[PDB]
Amino acid sequence: DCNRALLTRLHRQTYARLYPVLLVKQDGSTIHIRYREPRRMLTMP
Amino acid sequence: RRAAPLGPMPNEDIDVSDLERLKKYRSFDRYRRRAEQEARKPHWWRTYREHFGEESGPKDRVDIGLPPPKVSRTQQLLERKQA
Amino acid sequence: IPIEDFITPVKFLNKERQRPPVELPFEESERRALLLKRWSLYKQREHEMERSAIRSLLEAQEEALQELRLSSPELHAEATKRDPSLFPFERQGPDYTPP
Amino acid sequence: YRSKPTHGIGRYKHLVKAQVRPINLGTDYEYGVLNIHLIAYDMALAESYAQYVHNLCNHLAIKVEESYAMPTKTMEVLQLQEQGSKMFLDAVLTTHERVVQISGLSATFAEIFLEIIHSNLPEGVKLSVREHTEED
Amino acid sequence: SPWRLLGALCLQRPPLVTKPLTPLQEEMADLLQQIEIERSLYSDHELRALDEAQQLAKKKSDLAQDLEDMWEQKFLHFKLGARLTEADKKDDRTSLHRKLDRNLILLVREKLGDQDIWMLPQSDWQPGETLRQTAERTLATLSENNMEAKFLGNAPCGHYKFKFLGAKVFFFKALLLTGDFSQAGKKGHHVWVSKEELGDYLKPKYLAQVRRFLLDL
Amino acid sequence: VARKERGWGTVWPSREFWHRLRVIRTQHHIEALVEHRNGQVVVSASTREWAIKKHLYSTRNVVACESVGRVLAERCLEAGINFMVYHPTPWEAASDSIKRLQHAMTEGGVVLREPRRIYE
RNA sequence: AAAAAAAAAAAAAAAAAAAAAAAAAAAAAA
């Protein structure tokens, strides 16, 4: 059921280019942030 | 001087207690439909139908016919379904 | 003292010139449409199975609680009340890579 | 017309009324005024799960009152550069928050609800159950 | 009509890391990828990419690549935790670290004097006690672990009676936050098991119906 | 020369007509009718009728509204009536199914907008 | 005592809601 609401686009009428980003907070965990910078990955300390 | 309603009074059936929990027609349309439904029943009060000559209202039909063509139910239902 | 983020920023005004073209053959159109219809069927079965799932769950609740009252009245006095432990309920969603 | 059998035919306004406490009785126990905070980094994600919640409540007969978006929180993250010793570098993020408010509950519907809630939770999504008093 | 009072508990482990997608969900995923980047207005990266790609030619006749390659190498250089900590062992049903994708549940092995019992953990609650109290107490005491588990309600999940005497087994749901399991090698057999295994390992018809109020996911 | 029913005008739709186009759109089937103010439906085209039901696909479609339209059109000239009035709803009048309904009737040779009365 | 009349009238998929896929087994399983 984790994939229930996971499938979407941003519904605002006028908006920037949104690119898939892998984000590491401090866990060892990773998230997918849709963010305007094409960069493959970012990580927080 | 108040009188007594004769048979049903139209909206009486729904509960005024707790209106929030009752479902609504949010649509002009649904309303229209349910409306005309209520326009087609025999009300106990003077109505349009009554005065405006529905032309005899209910008629017991003297029917001189060709008796109805006899075919089978489930057969045709299946055939249709397949088609 | 309300401020929403809904408004369209001034940054996005005149850069509008970047994405004019879009064109599809009957093929991309057809593909995406089939995909859509199929997706509708799928999601519907999904909502349906979800609903019957939580429903059957709630029937386990029915049988349970009715059994508890039919057994012990003290037990439907105890457990029919909502406890203080639910107040700050917080849960974090799953992630992509384990820690 | 008062004297007729038909008086009150047209009468309606009792039908549409166009014109807070949790009730805890310990048996039929109504715990109302509940606040679901949905907090995440992704707008599409947030809006999606919010949508799913709101709709879910619509189907479960549990009545939703207010669904609204709380102010976004803008983070500036400073990362240590190794070359310059105490030198800082920067990257920007934003946290978005949605809220769905339910006016009524019972024990069994909470037990039931929380299950579907955290079961259907998305990746990168954080959830909160609270009480109505908060300050904007 | 004497009643025998037995508390019981359904112990739910949170699914940790997300599942990969149905082929249809994937096709839909790529589809929404396309359509979203379709209605996309410019990009700062794409502005500085395309404007400089066009401008360098007119400083030729009369950057973005840097960043692209920097990020390629910085992501490739990086490494991640594995998605499977179960199947590389592939063995342990008893590891609490086993299944990352699904929700997990505790079982126990007991052979009692007159009986052979496969036990979804059960409690004995005294008539004065509240089902709550005995649920928690027996939980923390039975497994010899330090367990942070946030329960949902004061109300129970599901109830199954065995009448010899007559008796009740009351199942509750405990949502596990963080467990600490002491003496990881203790003899008492605790089986941490998914939905599919909750189908298999369960003999009783009392426990056969706990997978009925379970979350299948 | 006959009498129309002038009136109402508190309510909706205007019940002034000899003949009216009544289109009832169900989630399943399109049913377009021709009405008399006696409430009696004169000539009707329904999707639940095996005749159209079996010839084409997907009852709810725009294709189907057009269909039922032409059907009712030929059935109209068969009845011989060239005139019925249509009162769409503002949000309905804008929708496509009804646009091309109206074209099916136009090209059928049927006129909407009943001719005016004589010495009204 | 067999889809959530003899085929019909909730549900799902283009700021959050709201408003252009289907149907007891061979009259005589509560």
Domain boundaries, chain A: 1-45
Q: Are strands D88-102 and D34-40 parallel, antiparallel or unpaired?
A: antiparallel
A44 with D77: Cβ contact below 8 A: yes
Which nucleotide lies at the shortest CA–C1' distance from D58? G17
Among protein residues, the one whose C-alpha sits closest to the C1' atom of G12 is: C44
Enumerate residues 6+ apart whose C-beta is below 8 A from F53: F47, F59
Q: How many CB pairs under 8 A join B and F?
A: 9
- Burial code (b: 16+ CB inside 10 Å, e: under 16) for F54-87 equals eeeeebeebebbbbbbbbbbebbeeeebeebbbb
Q: Are strands D23-24 and D29-30 parallel, antiparallel or unpaired?
A: antiparallel
Query: Which H, E and C letters describe E138-192, residue by residue?
Result: HHHHHCCEEEEEEECCCCCCEEEECCCCEEEEEEEEEEEEEEEECCCCCCCCEEE
Structure tokens at C80: 């029919």
Give the total number of structural domains in chain F: 1
Helix (H) or strand (E) holding E44: helix E44-60
Cα distance between residue F9 and residue B76, in whole Å: 48
Structure tokens at E152: 């949902």
Structure tokens at B37: 């439904």
CA D56 / C1′ G10 distance in Å? 16
The CATH number of residue C69's host domain is 6.10.250.3440
Amino acid type, E67? L
Domain ranges, residue F25:
1-120
Cα distance between residue A41 and residue E164, in whole Å: 63
The CATH number of residue F42's host domain is 3.30.420.80
Rg (CA), chain F: 15
A29 with C12: Cβ contact below 8 A: no
Asked if A17 contacts E34 with a C-beta cutoff of 8 angstroms, the reply is: no
Asked if E10 contacts E120 with a C-beta cutoff of 8 angstroms, the reply is: yes
Q: Which of E105, E139, E103, E112 is nearest to E124 (CA)?
A: E139
Asked whether strand G has any atom less than 7 Å from the CB of D50, the reply is yes
Give the total number of structural domains in chain C: 1
DSSP A9: -
A17 with E78: Cβ contact below 8 A: no
DSSP A30: -
Laid out side by side, the sheet with A41-43 consists of: A31-35, A19-24, A41-43
Distance from CA of C1 to the nearest CA of E (A): 31
CA A28 / C1′ G14 distance in Å? 40
Rg (CA), chain C: 26
Asked if E13 contacts E96 with a C-beta cutoff of 8 angstroms, the reply is: yes
Residues of C in contact with D27 (CB under 8 A): 76-77, 80-81
Residues of A in contact with D119 (CB under 8 A): 1
Residues of D numbered 15-54 whose beta carbons fall under 8 angstroms of chain E's beta carbons: which are they?
none
Beta bridge partners of A24: A43
Cα distance between residue E15 and residue E102, in whole Å: 5
Cα distance between residue D25 and residue D16, in whole Å: 30
User: How many CB atoms lie under 10 A from the CB of residue D57?
Assistant: 18
Q: Which of E215, E210, E212, E213 is nearest to E107 (CA)?
A: E210
Structure tokens at B13: 């059936």
Neighbours of chain D (3+ CB pairs under 8 A): A, B, C, E
Asked if C34 contacts D85 with a C-beta cutoff of 8 angstroms, the reply is: no
A3 with E35: Cβ contact below 8 A: no
Helix (H) or strand (E) holding B80: helix B73-82
| B57 Ramachandran zone, left/alpha/beta (phi>0; psi -120 to 50) | left
Neighbours of chain B (3+ CB pairs under 8 A): D, F
Query: Which experimental approach was used here?
Result: cryo-EM
Asked if E31 contacts C35 with a C-beta cutoff of 8 angstroms, the reply is: yes
Cα distance between residue C56 and residue B80, in whole Å: 37
Structure tokens at A11: 């519904």
Cα distance between residue E216 and residue E214, in whole Å: 6
The correct CATH number of A1-45 out of 2.60.40.10, 6.20.130.20, 3.60.10.10, 3.30.70.890 is 6.20.130.20
Asked if C76 contacts E137 with a C-beta cutoff of 8 angstroms, the reply is: no
> What are the backbone dihedrals phi and psi of residue F107, each rounded to the nearest 5 degrees, phi first?
-75, -20
CA F118 / C1′ G17 distance in Å? 52
Dihedral of CA atoms C35, C41, C47, C50 in degrees, nearest 10, equals -100
Domain ranges, residue C16:
1-99
Asked whether strand G has any atom less than 7 Å from the CB of C42, the reply is no
Dihedral of CA atoms E44, E46, E48, E52 in degrees, nearest 10, equals -170
- Is the peptide bond between E2 and the residue preceding it cis, with omega within 30 degrees of 0? no
Helix (H) or strand (E) holding D52: helix D43-59
CA B61 / C1′ G20 distance in Å? 45
Asked if D31 contacts D62 with a C-beta cutoff of 8 angstroms, the reply is: no
For helices C26-71 and E23-38, give the axis angle rounded to 10 degrees. 120
Cα distance between residue C89 and residue C80, in whole Å: 19
Structure tokens at E97: 């670290």
User: How many CB atoms lie under 10 A from the CB of residue B37?
Assistant: 9
Cα distance between residue F24 and residue F34, in whole Å: 11
Structure tokens at E187: 């003899």
Cα dist from F75 to C25, E113, E123, F50, F82, whole Å: 40, 87, 77, 16, 11
Q: Are strands F30-36 and F41-46 parallel, antiparallel or unpaired?
A: antiparallel
Q: Which of residues 14-43 of A touch strand G (CB under 7 A)?
A: none
Q: Which of B7, B31, B2, B32 is nearest to D16 (CA)?
A: B31
Helix (H) or strand (E) holding E200: helix E195-200
Per DSSP, the three-state class of B83 is coil
User: Which stretches does DSSP call E strand in chain E?
Assistant: 3-13, 104-111, 116-119, 122-123, 145-151, 158-161, 166-181, 190-193
Asked if E16 contacts E179 with a C-beta cutoff of 8 angstroms, the reply is: no
Per DSSP, the three-state class of D53 is helix
Max Cα separation, chain C? 73
Cα distance between residue A37 and residue E74, in whole Å: 15
Q: Which of F107, F105, F109, F114 is nearest to F83 (CA)?
A: F114
CA D84 / C1′ G25 distance in Å? 82
CA B13 / C1′ G30 distance in Å? 29
Cα distance between residue B17 and residue B14, in whole Å: 9
Quote the Cα angle for D101-D103-D107, to 5°: 110
Residues of E in contact with A2 (CB under 8 A): 15, 18-19, 217
Amino acid type, B64? I
The CATH number of residue E126's host domain is 3.90.79.10
Burial class (CB in 10 A: 0-12, 13-18, 19+), D11: exposed
Question: Tokens 């009324």 correspond to what residue?
Answer: D17
Asked if C90 contacts E156 with a C-beta cutoff of 8 angstroms, the reply is: no
Beta bridge partners of E11: E174
Cα distance between residue E61 and residue E54, in whole Å: 11
Structure tokens at D119: 């079961």
Domain boundaries, chain D: 1-136
Distance from CA of E217 to the nearest CA of A (A): 5
Asked whether strand G has any atom less than 7 Å from the CB of F102, the reply is no
Q: DSSP labels for C25-86?
A: -HHHHHHHHHHHHHHHHHHHHHHHHHHHHHHHHHHHHHHHHHHHHHH-HHHHHHTTSPPGGG
User: How many CB atoms lie under 10 A from the CB of residue A3?
Assistant: 18
Cα dist from D35 to B66, D64, D68, D103, whole Å: 71, 10, 11, 9
Q: How many CA atoms lie within 13 A of F108 on its CB side?
A: 28
Asked whether strand G has any atom less than 7 Å from the CB of F117, the reply is no
Cα distance between residue F104 and residue C11, in whole Å: 49
Question: Tokens 């907008």 correspond to what residue?
Answer: F113
Beta bridge partners of E56: none
Given 3-state DSSP classes, what are the helix, strand and coil percentages for chain A, each rounded to the nearest 5?
0, 35, 65
Q: Check contact C-E (3+ Cβ pairs < 8 Å).
A: yes
**Smallest Cβ distance to B45: which of D6, D15, D16?**
D6
Q: DSSP labels for chain F?
A: ---------SSSS----SEEEEEEE-SS-EEEEEEETTS-EEEEEESSSHHHHHHSS-TTSHHHHHHHHHHHHHHHHHHT--B-EE---HHHHTSHHHHHHHHHHHHHT-B-SPPPPS--
Cα distance between residue A35 and residue A26, in whole Å: 19
DSSP A26: T
Cα distance between residue E162 and residue F55, in whole Å: 62
Q: How many CA atoms lie within 13 A of B75 on its CB side?
A: 3
Asked if E123 contacts E7 with a C-beta cutoff of 8 angstroms, the reply is: yes
